[PDB]
Paper text:
Broadly neutralizing antibodies (bnAbs), capable of neutralizing diverse [name]-1 strains and subtypes, represent promising tools for immunotherapy and prevention. bnAbs target conserved epitopes on the [name]-1 [name] trimer, including the CD4 binding site ([name]), glycan-dependent sites at the V3 base and V2 region, the gp120–gp41 interface, the membrane-proximal external region, the fusion peptide and the silent face. The highly conserved [name] is critical for virus engagement of host cells. VRC01-class members, encoded by the immunoglobulin heavy chain gene segment IGHV1-2, include a five-residue light chain complementary-determining region 3 (CDRL3) and are characterized by high somatic hypermutation. To elucidate mechanisms of [name] recognition, we determined single-particle cryo-electron microscopy (cryo-EM) structures of a BG505SOSIP.664 trimer unbound (2.9 Å) and in complex with representative Fabs from each expanded B cell clone: 04_A06 (3.8 Å), 01_D03 (3.2 Å) and 05_B08 (3.3 Å).
From 831 expressed monoclonal antibodies, we identified 04_A06, a VH1-2-encoded broadly neutralizing antibody to the CD4 binding site with remarkable breadth and potency against multiclade pseudovirus panels (geometric mean half-maximal inhibitory concentration = 0.059 µg ml−1, breadth = 98.5%, 332 strains). 04_A06 contains an 11-amino-acid insertion in the framework region heavy chain 1 (FWRH1) that contacts highly conserved [name] residues (>99%), providing a structural explanation for its remarkable antiviral activity. In each structure, R71 of the heavy chain contacts D368 of gp120, a feature typical of VRC01-class antibodies and a hallmark of CD4-mimetic bnAbs12. Additionally, the VH1-2-encoded heavy chain N58 is mutated to K58 in 04_A06 and IOMA, mimicking the interaction of CD4 K35 with [name] residues N280 and R456 of gp120. Although 04_A06 features a five-amino-acid-long CDRL3 characteristic of VRC01-class bnAbs, it also shares key somatic hypermutations and structural determinants with IOMA shaping recognition of the [name]. Contacts between 04_A06 and the adjacent protomer were mediated exclusively via a protruding CDRH1 in 04_A06, a consequence of the 11-residue FWRH1 insertion, which also contacted the primary protomer. D26 is also positioned adjacent to gp120 R304 (93.5% conserved), whereas residues within the tip of the 04_A06 CDRH1 (heavy chain Y31–Y35C) are in close proximity to residues H66 and H72 on gp120 (99.9% and 96.2% conserved, respectively). Together, these residues could form interactions that permit tolerance to structural variability within the [name] on the primary [name] protomer (for example, the addition of a potential N-linked glycosylation site at gp120 N279).
Numbering used by the authors:
A (entry chain A): 33 to 57, 65 to 138, 147 to 185, 188 to 306, 309 to 321, 321A, 322 to 397, 411 to 504
B (entry chain I): 2 to 35, 35A, 35B, 35C, 35D, 35E, 35F, 35G, ...
C (entry chain M): 2 to 91, 96 to 108
D (entry chain B), E (entry chain D): 519 to 546, 566 to 663
F (entry chain C): 300 to 306, 309 to 321, 321A, 322 to 353
G (entry chain C): 148 to 185, 188 to 192
H (entry chain E): 193 to 245
The structure:
């Protein structure tokens, strides 16, 4: 006959949701010091014979990452000076000394009364603000843009915005399944499951149109989308090769400290030494063309060989979406990137992308709070890799095979899906029952 | 959610038209773990109905950062924008032709992954007439 | 994507059971929405995801999916159901619609 | 040796040979977001382990990786042959096809253990 | 079946017949007041369960709902007849009338378990 | 009173919601309790209260 | 008759978005929320 | 005030007493505190008389 036999520690897992703690290998915004020190040698175990279903679009890990990042961004802002007295009438004049053609009117020389350390005493100081930061009031009178419907809190200058890689490690009794298939699109079974205690180094880079500093595809460019037929779901593109990008802020900026109260300092923008030029991001023309060729080659599969693929720039919206926004050494850029998605495709040189600077940043679109990025002394310059794209296909008539793709973004979750695509969270269930010929005495 | 649109408009060929759509107290959501009012990721769709005809889709705007997707039959003369402060959406149609006479509706989309392109709530409709 | 829906018009008496078809050119899963427009009135959501009733909609409304063939079934027809029916698939609206009037 | 969940896709016997390696990994600052997440994860792991330990204890099988009982196999949960089960199946499918009968089996194990212990009491007393 | 504390007013034997149902219920976010209260309650429950489980473990009765020992019962604690105790008394009064002698009983249990285990080791070694 | 909530912005992102002009007549806010029901309930209460006194 | 004096039509100088700029606005306060200071001055 | 150009002060609440109250630091379960009973113990090196508390 047969009898019920209980087994402990059987390899059985179910899909489940749980809290994931941080591990990582100056003070930073992500509080990576609070993350537990990861093991120097991660343990990765290959689960042969296993075929596990994956779905990154319904993965919880992206939502939990979003919550964790926004919570960290908020918490790093609490012990920082609040610039509520900055919402004062501004007298801004055009800056027209050693400026180029493209820089005419983008910076403003604003002077304003400001609260001195002694409350009764007042002082007149001056600062430089970019045109996107100040709005006219109807020299002329200006005000900080968010002062109408937001309270300004200066980001503490000493905390670095640099993305330090963080590993999301599940607690005991939970496992993280890594999809090691190199030809795996975002959905469907992945017959190369291997478990790891937790994920590789994830850099929470904040970008909108181009995925910076991300992880590369192993074999070829991949086109992952929830519903390729749905012309509203963002198309996640991953590059098999990195596309390098020079860029810098040519202005020799100086940080001038203005004491606005007891132990409260507001860091303004002093006079620029030398000429004033335009912040611009460089992309190699040939490398970008080759990457676009690979992308369009891999994109013909989901639409057909004879179809015409044309890349057009952003269709409109706020500055963060119409441009390629990201942080670089503490400054937030807004790059045009109209020369990138401009060509059409049918069956040494560099592309200069004119960028613009903002200091009032309202990432996460929080109602009532906004961040003032302190200026960075000296000439900032960063080199990154474009490892992905955020493309949004338009509609079209039934008489046309021209599929127009434009850069999208805004939803940071889409940025972080391209890094958590190959992972999922499972719950170990070690109790198993199976009939056996043994019977308890 | 209640939707309010602007009144009737009269226009000449080649002019420009702006119709407003306000959705009071619906642009913001409360993420509980995050403990604040954030602007939700809603979509406001813009649709028109010619006299006696069926419905036609124009375009929709994402409330989060203003992402816009436009029907190819109107690209180049259509512009949809939203103002998060006033919780209003603006349709800006240019180079109006005599066939654009229609009742223009603004629709609310919760943008739920499990229900693609759900148009849950609709405004009262706006009559836009063009003639010479 | 192209969506077709038929018949163009139909007349039914009070209480009858009638159905309306909405054919899609490609597999779209269950992403079909059904809309009611009374004459001179703004349309409102009727069925979403092809089988889920919108809030406030009576249980007499039923939608079903057969591969790429979608049907919306009307039970015990009532006078307020007069009007036109539209089925939505993403950005595509079927041309013309189906006008339903009393007999 | 393969490691944690090493024999997940292996057969029944090979998986049963190495229960211990998955058995050990079932158990192994300020009020910051990372800190509170770490603390909640720790407590969740502790309780997840203890629920399983309690379930094993009720059936009179605490401390034993493999424990036999006195609950007959109803043959309605699964009538598959022993050789097929223990040489041509993985634990995942086995749990897949008994997801609904688990509770009644647990209840039978509990009641059978209880009666068994009280029976022992009578003999140890007499 | 009666449920959690179903046999609270039952006799001694009937209550002991269903120890499992009370035995299975001893074990089964942000920093908000409700959240912190939930976490404190969770930790309190887990610690209480492990205190009880450890206390059973010391007496060498882990995993056993009803376990016998080798310490005599001094009549000073209670001289009542067994038939009266097990047929005309509930556990509440029983705990009521032995609240004071509990600690010395626990100590005798611990000492007896230690000595018995040492004797068992001596026999196993020889 | 048909009160109107007038939003007064007192600072950056800070809004103080004031009280605007009232449309129509201004009356007294009041509560209504049925006389017979309240009397019956008081009778039951006094009947149950005579026991302790 | 019963509402005589229960409402107070109070107008006050209030700060605005621009810190230096002031602003004058009015609001209605119930008599139990405002106390006289010794039209009249209230707080 | 000397603070005014380097810091912002918060007045200590007058009702809280700054007087030192003895407090004992107790290790959790599974941990012990070793108290050196040597009266000539200079703080470094072995302590021949160790008592736990
Ligand atoms: C992608 O990764 C690259 C390489 O890690 C990032 O470039 C790095 O950017 C940081 C600041 O943006 C640079 O640190 C700074 O270096 C200067 C000069 O040494 C120093 O004066 C500053 O105090 C600061 O330490 C770092 O050197 C640079 N690494 C390079 C150029 O190899 C890049 O920012 C990343 N892309 C992002 C975050 O979008
Ligand atoms: C378009 O998206 C919908 C919804 O995301 C998909 O519908 C799902 O299809 C799977 C098929 O395995 C079902 O199990 C789900 O229940 C469906 N979810 C729904 C209807 O909400 C659909 O498959 C997608 N189609 C394409 C062509 O991408
Ligand atoms: C980006 O590329 C442009 C040209 O493609 C660079 O501009 C040149 O900069 C050098 C200084 O190193 C000047 O001598 C040239 O006259 C510039 N050429 C122009 C303005 O057409 C620019 O320096 C690059 N930026 C980087 C690498 O950060
Ligand atoms: C981004 O900047 C780096 C400099 O750090 C460029 O790398 C240099 O490229 C030139 C070719 O013009 C080589 O001669 C140098 O040896 C490189 N320096 C290195 C690798 O340290 C890189 O080419 C720039 N990217 C683009 C697209 O212009
Ligand atoms: C995308 O490209 C088009 C054309 O290449 C841009 O259209 C121009 O917009 C500016 C407004 O800033 C006008 O002054 C020009 O006349 C337009 N040129 C046209 C219509 O040919 C459009 O602005 C670009 N979009 C973004 C987000 O940069
Ligand atoms: C992004 O770049 C494009 C082209 O580089 C800009 O479009 C040009 O804008 C100027 C501004 O007056 C016009 O004179 C040109 O006719 C436009 N087209 C071209 C092909 O140059 C576009 O405005 C830029 N986006 C910005 C500045 O937001
Ligand atoms: C309080 O108000 C409710 C509803 O406004 C009253 O209930 C109504 O009472 C009338 C009798 O005067 C009935 O004709 C209605 O059918 C009732 N409607 C409902 C919904 O209950 C109630 O009587 C009022 N009570 C008092 C003390 O004023
Ligand atoms: C800005 O104006 C101040 C006077 O208020 C002047 O001293 C300073 O040089 C000006 N800077 C620039 C860049 O124009
Ligand atoms: C100053 O800059 C503004 C841009 O905001 C521009 O409109 C204005 O014409 C400039 N003034 C002069 C005198 O050039
Ligand atoms: C500062 O205040 C004085 C006082 O009248 C005023 O004249 C001057 O214009 C102010 N400076 C500004 C607003 O920059
Ligand atoms: C604040 O003022 C700016 C000035 O242009 C305006 O654009 C914005 O809509 C205003 N915000 C409000 C009224 O909430
Ligand atoms: C994704 O992969 C699965 C499994 O290989 C396949 O069925 C599906 O067609 C692929 N594409 C999409 C969009 O799901
Ligand atoms: C960028 O790409 C280079 C190779 O082109 C690589 O060595 C470097 O590590 C990359 N940086 C990242 C991924 O942050
Ligand atoms: C920027 O200006 C400072 C003067 O304050 C100078 O020391 C430094 O060398 C300059 N940097 C560059 C890159 O010119
Ligand atoms: C990129 O490649 C395409 C291939 O057809 C070519 O037409 C185009 O001129 C190239 N652009 C360059 C080399 O800048
Ligand atoms: C886009 O391409 C067209 C020709 O294909 C060219 O005339 C135009 O200048 C390009 N836009 C840029 C380089 O911004
Ligand atoms: C996978 O299956 C094959 C045959 O089905 C078997 O020989 C092999 O041992 C299995 N893998 C593992 C790790 O046991
Ligand atoms: C309660 O008492 C009655 C009479 O003493 C007894 O028959 C009954 O069994 C008791 N209840 C339980 C649950 O044992
Ligand atoms: C209150 O006033 C509003 C107009 O501001 C009106 O729509 C509403 O009907 C009024 N309420 C009552 C009860 O009269
Ligand atoms: C309450 O009812 C009692 C009896 O019905 C009666 O005597 C008394 O007068 C009533 N009082 C009031 C206030 O209705
Ligand atoms: C004004 O209102 C107050 C209520 O506090 C009242 O005492 C006073 O008589 C009123 N004065 C006039 C002129 O109505
Ligand atoms: C209150 O006074 C203001 C003028 O300060 C006036 O406009 C308003 O109508 C008054 N409200 C009343 C009398 O209810
Ligand atoms: C506001 O201040 C002015 C300045 O003198 C004063 O005349 C006026 O009465 C004030 N308004 C009040 C107190 O409501
Ligand atoms: C504050 O003032 C004192 C003199 O009153 C001075 O010695 C000290 O350096 C000042 N600290 C600053 C300006 O940070
Ligand atoms: C304390 O006593 C020990 C005894 O071995 C000795 O080694 C050590 O140097 C002494 N330390 C001091 C500060 O004298």
């Amino acid at each position: 006959n047969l009898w019920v036999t209980v087994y402990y520690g059987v390899p059985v897992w179910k899909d489940a949701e749980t809290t994931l703690f941080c591990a990582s290998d100056k003070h930073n915004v992500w509080a990576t010091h609070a993350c537990v020190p990861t093991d120097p040698n991660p343990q990765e175990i290959h689960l042969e014979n296993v075929t596990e279903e994956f779905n990154m679009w319904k993965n919880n890990m992206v939502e939990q990452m979003h919550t964790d990042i926004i919570s960290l961004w908020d918490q790093s802002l609490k012990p920082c000076v609040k610039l509520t007295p900055l919402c004062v009438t501004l007298q801004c004049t055009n800056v027209t000394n050693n400026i180029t053609d493209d820089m005419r009117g983008e910076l403003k020389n604003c002077s304003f009364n400001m609260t001195t350390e002694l409350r009764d005493k007042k002082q007149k100081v001056y600062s430089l603000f970019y045109r996107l930061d100040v709005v006219q009031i109807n020299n002329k009178e200006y005000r900080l843009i968010n002062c109408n419907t937001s309270a300004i809190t200066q980001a503490c200058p000493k905390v670095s915005f640099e993305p330090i890689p963080i590993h999301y490690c599940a607690p005991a009794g939970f496992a993280i399944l890594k999809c090691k298939d190199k030809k795996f699109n975002g959905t469907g079974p992945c017959p190369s499951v291997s478990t790891v205690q937790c994920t590789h180094g994830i850099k929470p880079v904040v970008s909108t149109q181009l995925l910076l500093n991300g992880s590369l595809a192993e074999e070829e460019v991949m086109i992952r989308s929830e519903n390729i037929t749905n012309n509203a779901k963002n198309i996640l593109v991953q590059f098999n090769t990195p596309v390098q990008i020079n860029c810098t802020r040519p202005n020799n900026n100086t940080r001038k400290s203005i004491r606005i109260g007891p132990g409260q300092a507001f860091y303004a923008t002093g006079d620029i030494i030398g000429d004033i030029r335009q912040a611009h991001c460089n992309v190699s023309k040939a490398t970008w063309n080759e990457t676009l060729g690979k992308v369009v080659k891999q994109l013909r599969k989901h639409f057909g060989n004879n179809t015409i693929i044309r890349f057009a720039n952003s269709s409109g919206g706020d500055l963060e979406v119409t441009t390629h926004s990201f942080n670089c050494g503490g400054e937030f850029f807004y790059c045009n990137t109209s020369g990138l998605f401009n060509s059409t495709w049918i069956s040494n040189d560099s592309i200069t992308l004119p960028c613009r600077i903002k200091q009032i940043i309202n990432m996460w679109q929080r109602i009532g709070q906004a961040m003032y990025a302190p200026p960075i002394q000296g000439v900032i310059r960063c080199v990154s890799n474009i490892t992905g794209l955020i493309l949004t296909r338009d509609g079209g008539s039934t008489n046309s095979t021209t599929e127009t793709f434009r850069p999208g973004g805004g939803d940071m979750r889409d940025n972080w899906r391209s890094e958590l695509y190959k992972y999922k969270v499972v719950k170990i269930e070690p109790l198993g029952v199976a009939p056996t010929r043994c019977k308890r005495r | 959610v209640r939707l309010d649109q602007s009144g009737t408009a009269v226009k000449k060929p080649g002019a420009s038209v702006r119709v407003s759509c306000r959705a009071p107290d619906s642009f913001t959501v409360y993420r509980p773990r995050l403990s604040a009012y954030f602007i939700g990721e809603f979509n406001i769709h813009w649709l028109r109905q010619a006299p006696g005809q069926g419905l036609e889709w124009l375009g929709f705007v994402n409330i989060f950062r203003g992402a816009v997707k436009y029907s190819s039959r109107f690209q180049g003369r259509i512009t949809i924008t939203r103002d998060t402060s006033s919780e209003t959406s603006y349709l800006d149609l240019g180079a109006l032709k005599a066939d654009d006479t229609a009742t223009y509706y603004c629709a609310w989309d919760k943008n739920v992954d499990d229900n693609p392109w759900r148009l849950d709530s609709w405004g009262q409709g706006t009559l836009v007439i063009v003639s010479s | 994507i192209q969506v077709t829906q038929s018949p163009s018009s139909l007349s039914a008496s009070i209480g009858d059971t009638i159905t309306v078809a909405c054919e899609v050119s490609q597999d779209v899963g269950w992403a079909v929405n059904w809309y009611h427009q009374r004459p001179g009135r703004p349309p409102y959501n009727l069925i979403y995801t092809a089988h889920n009733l919108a809030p406030g909609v009576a249980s007499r409304f039923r939608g079903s999916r057969v591969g790429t063939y979608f049907t919306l079934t009307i039970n015990n027809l009532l006078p307020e159901d007069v009007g036109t029916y539209y089925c939505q698939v993403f950005d595509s609206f079927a041309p013309g619609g189906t006008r339903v009037d009393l007999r | 040796f393969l490691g944690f969940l090493g024999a997940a896709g292996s057969t029944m016997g090979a998986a049963s040979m190495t229960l211990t390696v998955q058995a050990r990994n079932l158990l192994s600052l300020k009020l910051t977001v990372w800190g509170i997440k770490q603390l909640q994860a720790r407590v969740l792991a502790v309780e997840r382990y203890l629920r399983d330990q309690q379930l094993l204890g009720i059936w009179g099988c605490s401390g034993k990786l493999i424990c036999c009982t006195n609950v007959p196999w109803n043959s309605s949960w699964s009538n598959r042959n022993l050789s097929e089960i223990w040489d041509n199946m993985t634990w995942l499918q086995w749990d897949k096809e008994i997801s609904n009968y688990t509770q009644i089996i647990y209840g039978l194990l509990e009641e059978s253990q209880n009666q068994q212990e009280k029976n022992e009491q009578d003999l140890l007393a007499l």
